[PDB]
Design a protein around this motif. Structure first.
Motif, PDB file in Angstrom:
ATOM      1  N   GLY A  56     -36.180   3.616  82.710  1.00 37.99           N
ATOM      2  CA  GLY A  56     -36.014   5.037  82.909  1.00 37.99           C
ATOM      3  C   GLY A  56     -35.864   5.789  81.611  1.00 37.99           C
ATOM      4  O   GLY A  56     -36.281   5.304  80.563  1.00 37.99           O
ATOM      5  N   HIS A  57     -35.243   6.961  81.665  1.00 41.30           N
ATOM      6  CA  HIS A  57     -35.082   7.821  80.503  1.00 41.30           C
ATOM      7  C   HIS A  57     -34.197   7.133  79.461  1.00 41.30           C
ATOM      8  O   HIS A  57     -33.714   6.021  79.657  1.00 41.30           O
ATOM      9  CB  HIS A  57     -34.501   9.155  80.949  1.00 41.30           C
ATOM     10  CG  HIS A  57     -34.824  10.302  80.049  1.00 41.30           C
ATOM     11  ND1 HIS A  57     -35.328  10.142  78.780  1.00 41.30           N
ATOM     12  CD2 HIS A  57     -34.706  11.635  80.238  1.00 41.30           C
ATOM     13  CE1 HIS A  57     -35.500  11.326  78.224  1.00 41.30           C
ATOM     14  NE2 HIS A  57     -35.129  12.249  79.090  1.00 41.30           N
ATOM     15  N   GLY A 208     -39.214   9.277  92.758  1.00 42.82           N
ATOM     16  CA  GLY A 208     -39.279   9.275  91.319  1.00 42.82           C
ATOM     17  C   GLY A 208     -37.998   9.702  90.652  1.00 42.82           C
ATOM     18  O   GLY A 208     -37.899   9.614  89.424  1.00 42.82           O
ATOM     19  N   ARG A 209     -37.021  10.179  91.413  1.00 43.49           N
ATOM     20  CA  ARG A 209     -35.792  10.633  90.780  1.00 43.49           C
ATOM     21  C   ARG A 209     -34.768   9.517  90.720  1.00 43.49           C
ATOM     22  O   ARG A 209     -34.113   9.319  89.694  1.00 43.49           O
ATOM     23  CB  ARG A 209     -35.233  11.831  91.521  1.00 43.49           C
ATOM     24  CG  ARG A 209     -34.159  12.549  90.779  1.00 43.49           C
ATOM     25  CD  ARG A 209     -33.721  13.714  91.593  1.00 43.49           C
ATOM     26  NE  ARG A 209     -32.575  14.398  91.027  1.00 43.49           N
ATOM     27  CZ  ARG A 209     -31.674  15.028  91.766  1.00 43.49           C
ATOM     28  NH1 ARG A 209     -31.796  15.028  93.082  1.00 43.49           N
ATOM     29  NH2 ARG A 209     -30.650  15.641  91.197  1.00 43.49           N
ATOM     30  N   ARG A 211     -35.699   6.772  90.395  1.00 44.36           N
ATOM     31  CA  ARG A 211     -36.309   5.965  89.358  1.00 44.36           C
ATOM     32  C   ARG A 211     -36.087   6.546  87.981  1.00 44.36           C
ATOM     33  O   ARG A 211     -36.342   5.863  86.992  1.00 44.36           O
ATOM     34  CB  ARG A 211     -37.796   5.836  89.610  1.00 44.36           C
ATOM     35  CG  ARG A 211     -38.379   4.642  88.998  1.00 44.36           C
ATOM     36  CD  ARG A 211     -38.472   3.553  90.003  1.00 44.36           C
ATOM     37  NE  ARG A 211     -39.827   3.045  90.066  1.00 44.36           N
ATOM     38  CZ  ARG A 211     -40.403   2.343  89.099  1.00 44.36           C
ATOM     39  NH1 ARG A 211     -39.741   2.062  87.991  1.00 44.36           N
ATOM     40  NH2 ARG A 211     -41.647   1.920  89.238  1.00 44.36           N
ATOM     41  N   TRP A 212     -35.648   7.794  87.896  1.00 44.55           N
ATOM     42  CA  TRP A 212     -35.281   8.365  86.609  1.00 44.55           C
ATOM     43  C   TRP A 212     -33.986   7.761  86.101  1.00 44.55           C
ATOM     44  O   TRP A 212     -33.923   7.251  84.981  1.00 44.55           O
ATOM     45  CB  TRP A 212     -35.161   9.875  86.735  1.00 44.55           C
ATOM     46  CG  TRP A 212     -36.467  10.534  86.728  1.00 44.55           C
ATOM     47  CD1 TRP A 212     -37.629  10.019  86.274  1.00 44.55           C
ATOM     48  CD2 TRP A 212     -36.762  11.835  87.205  1.00 44.55           C
ATOM     49  NE1 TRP A 212     -38.636  10.923  86.429  1.00 44.55           N
ATOM     50  CE2 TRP A 212     -38.124  12.051  87.002  1.00 44.55           C
ATOM     51  CE3 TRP A 212     -36.003  12.841  87.785  1.00 44.55           C
ATOM     52  CZ2 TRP A 212     -38.741  13.222  87.357  1.00 44.55           C
ATOM     53  CZ3 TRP A 212     -36.612  14.000  88.132  1.00 44.55           C
ATOM     54  CH2 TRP A 212     -37.968  14.189  87.921  1.00 44.55           C
ATOM     55  N   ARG A 214     -31.980   4.520  86.205  1.00 42.78           N
ATOM     56  CA  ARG A 214     -32.795   3.338  85.967  1.00 42.78           C
ATOM     57  C   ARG A 214     -32.816   2.333  87.108  1.00 42.78           C
ATOM     58  O   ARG A 214     -32.579   1.146  86.884  1.00 42.78           O
ATOM     59  CB  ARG A 214     -32.306   2.662  84.701  1.00 42.78           C
ATOM     60  CG  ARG A 214     -31.664   3.634  83.752  1.00 42.78           C
ATOM     61  CD  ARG A 214     -31.232   2.932  82.512  1.00 42.78           C
ATOM     62  NE  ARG A 214     -30.938   3.844  81.424  1.00 42.78           N
ATOM     63  CZ  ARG A 214     -30.691   3.436  80.192  1.00 42.78           C
ATOM     64  NH1 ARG A 214     -30.712   2.148  79.924  1.00 42.78           N
ATOM     65  NH2 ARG A 214     -30.440   4.299  79.226  1.00 42.78           N
TER      66      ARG A 214
END
Lengths: 275, 88
Positions: A56-57, A208-209, A211-212, A214
């Motif tokens: 992730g980020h 997808g969030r 998944r942001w 991690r």
RNA sequence: UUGAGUGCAGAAGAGGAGAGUGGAAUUCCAUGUGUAGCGGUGAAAUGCGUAGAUAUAUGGAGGAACACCAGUGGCGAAGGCGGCUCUCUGGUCUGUAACUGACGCUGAGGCUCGAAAGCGUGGGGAGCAAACAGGAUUAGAUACCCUGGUAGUCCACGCCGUAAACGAUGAGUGCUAAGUGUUGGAGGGUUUCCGCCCUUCAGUGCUGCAGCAAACGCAUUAAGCACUCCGCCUGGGGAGU
RNA sequence: CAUGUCCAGGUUGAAGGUGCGGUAAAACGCACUGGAGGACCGAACCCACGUACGUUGAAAAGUGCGGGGAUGAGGUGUGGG
RNA sequence: AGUCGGGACCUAAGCCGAGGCCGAUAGGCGUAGGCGAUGGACAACAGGUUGAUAUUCCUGUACCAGUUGUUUUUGUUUGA
RNA sequence: UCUCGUUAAGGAACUCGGCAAAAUGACCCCGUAACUUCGGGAGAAGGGGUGCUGACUUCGGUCAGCCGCAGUGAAUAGGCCCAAGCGACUGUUUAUCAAAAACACAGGUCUCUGCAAAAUCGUAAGAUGAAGUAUAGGGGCUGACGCCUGCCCGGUGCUGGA
């Protein structure tokens, strides 16, 4: 509070997210950052140990104070912030001597306060006392375990812990999750519950969030092939044929306890109730 | 709400002459003060239904006195509402 | 300046919201004593008990409702409000007669409040109890009786908007015999009156005359005499479908 | 995993703000501004749904003509587990 | 090729790891220290020339860091 | 045999199935239903104009005239509607016979775990979970949203018992 995005496209139907309506600035302190890595669940050997991690980020670690040892010097809070690591905000403090460090954010702290943390402070939100001189009935946190180690008990947002009663040795406590125990009377703690209290009321909405942050997809059990998980196989949708539903290595999942029967704490635990 | 201090103080800054406790200008000034304070109290405890009712009654009474002030003279009415600042 | 309202001087109140706090009781828990029953019924049974029950004594925990004062008493527009203390806050009544000069009443559409049951989200859970289980009575008993028990009952913020929500009695205002208690006042004599007596304002009950009513009954708190403004009705079913 | 890099052109108008109006203050209505999105049409890029041929093939998995996504759970380069 | 890309500079993932902690032998793991561009930091431009080379050869105008020679301020305290 | 072009009259009679081909396709203007989570369906449907010359151009365009069978004159450039099942959606999947009704997915629920946490790799030191601390972290089933989610604990597991 909590926003409620207007439903425009399906992957936006009922998302929710904070306002960030108290965070003051958006620029951290320089001398408090430290780098990090995203282990993606891997050892020195280089294998998965815990599944569903990584990807992730980016994040950079913020060295929070945890022992609260500077005593008899007033501490001034200046700014709250956002933190990606824990689930609770953070405050920056200036001591009169000219040193900086962070603090967790108790539920009710505001800029402009002044905090002290000696063995003879006053009991108001923010102060960090030794566990003895905290009177009966209060709601405290950042509780230690071994005197001088820092805080390791209640640490995350929206959590409480009363103090039931002292002894000659040691002090009792009603932890969160409703289980009583006792810890040495010479441990540090601060008062008041942790900060962001609705951080449990956030419906993420998209895939997808999550998944942001991690995370990672986690297949059902009963889909895998028999040689790869005890539930799997069976042509069609099948029910759990084996008794006692299982994890992928044994250890039935529902009902089974897992303390360590010869633990070194049962002398200090009264009424494990909620596990 | 208010106590005799400001209650007596204001009735001399809008007094038409000495002893004007009638004087539909003064009464509406006083009511304005009190409904302001009651608005504050209501914003504080917003479930005190048994006093919002009195708020309503005071608002209505001020409305009536204003209507009466207008239909006997206009310059007083305009000059006052420009003096007190109301009437959206 | 009589209606209305404001000033000045006083009076009472389970009127409302927020913040803490007290004792009694039921129950669970810990321990000492303690021996075979307890509990239940018209009669019985189900049930808990010799893994020591009921009883009994000491302490701890937790939630809920406030014994006596309690009164055809009080307050509120109605629904309704009773442990104690504090911070904020509305309304009513008597006196005086400073002050404005009819500023009033009612009020279709609109807005606000609205018992209990019910829904949502998060807490909390001692008693009590729809559903449900077991035991009984009965020709049958998915009911009345007994032993358990889940949602609910409580708290915060939203939602619904209904009762025999009743005095089955719309609101404003004025006039027409009496007697009798009671809550809060203001005046006058006796006065230790703060314990009597007299006059008056405001609520609040019982008896009763004119008048009215198809009778039952109501009668200064009219269902009498009259004006103003609103709502509603026109055979019973079909159906508030 | 760490460090760089690439996405022609075009369209739609959430939150928010500003200004009017309405109210005792308010829900609220109308404009202008504002530019969110696993948003939209479509090349490079990434794929591989139908069909015809090819099947000692130009090719030990393609071609022609059509097709999908295209600011993201994106594509890829270098060094690594 | 002083000037361009790399070395005589810095570090990320990762690896090696004096001592050291474990393990039938083999060896496993790790501190201090290092190695590691895909990143950081850093002094040259235009034209001409050959069959083949050109910010390298040539012309003209520059820049970086140093070394010698005549060309301008003295208590190593430190006002050098 | 393959890759292309054209066709009288009929226009799905072929066929397992309109597979394949044919038909629409640009810009501007008018107009647009059921249904609904109120955002959408919607480029819904169905229609009209486009060339050249002159004049006026307020500014955009409006008038007049000219030619062809045909005026975005070539290439590029959505076929549409009425109902049912499955799946909520954007994604992902058997490199090389299956791209879906399969998996993922946001939400639901049970359960474990008080920190040297459970869990996993390793004989161990050491590690990941984590520089985290129950609003957190793992495991099992279900798969937006709306209304809901009945009966049985005799048997098999799990937890508690002495």
């Amino acid at each position: 509070a909590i926003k409620k995005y207007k439903p425009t496209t399906n992957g936006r139907r009922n998302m929710t997210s904070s306002d960030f309506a108290e965070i003051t600035t958006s620029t951290p302190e320089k001398s408090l950052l430290q780098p990090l890595k995203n282990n993606a669940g891997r050892n020195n050997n280089g294998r998965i140990t815990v599944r569903h991690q990584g990807g992730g980020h980016k994040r950079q670690y913020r060295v929070i104070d945890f022992k609260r040892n500077k005593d008899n010097v007033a501490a001034v809070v200046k700014t709250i912030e956002y933190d990606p690591n824990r689930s609770a905000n953070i405050a920056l403090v200036h001591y009169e001597d000219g040193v900086k460090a962070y603090i967790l954010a108790p539920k009710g702290l505001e800029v402009g306060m002044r905090l002290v943390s000696g063995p003879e402070a006053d009991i108001k939100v923010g102060n960090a006392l030794p566990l003895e001189n905290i009177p009966v009935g209060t709601v405290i946190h950042n509780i230690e375990m071994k005197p001088g180690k820092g805080g390791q008990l209640i640490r995350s947002a929206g959590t409480s812990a009363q103090v039931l009663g002292k002894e000659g040795k040691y002090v009792l406590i009603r932890l969160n999750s409703g289980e009583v125990r006792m810890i040495l009377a010479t441990c540090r703690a601060t008062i008041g519950s942790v900060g962001n209290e609705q951080h449990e009321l956030i419906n993420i909405g998209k895939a997808g969030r999550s998944r942001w942050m991690r995370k990672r997809p986690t297949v059902r059990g009963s889909v895998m092939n028999p040689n790869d998980h005890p539930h799997g196989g069976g042509e069609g949708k099948t029910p759990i044929g084996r008794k006692a539903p299982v994890s992928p290595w044994g250890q039935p999942a529902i009902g089974y306890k897992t303390r360590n029967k010869k633990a070194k704490s049962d002398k200090l635990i009264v009424r494990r109730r909620t596990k | 709400a208010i106590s005799q201090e400001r209650k007596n103080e204001i009735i001399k800054e809008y007094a038409r002459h000495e002893g004007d406790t009638g004087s539909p200008e003064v009464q509406i000034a006083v009511l304005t003060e009190d409904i302001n304070q009651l608005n504050e109290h209501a914003r504080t405890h917003k479930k005190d239904h048994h006093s919002y009712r009195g708020l309503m009654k005071k608002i209505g009474h001020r409305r009536n006195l204003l209507a009466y002030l207008r239909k006997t003279d206009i310059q007083r009415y305009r000059e006052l509402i420009q003096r007190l600042g109301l009437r959206r």
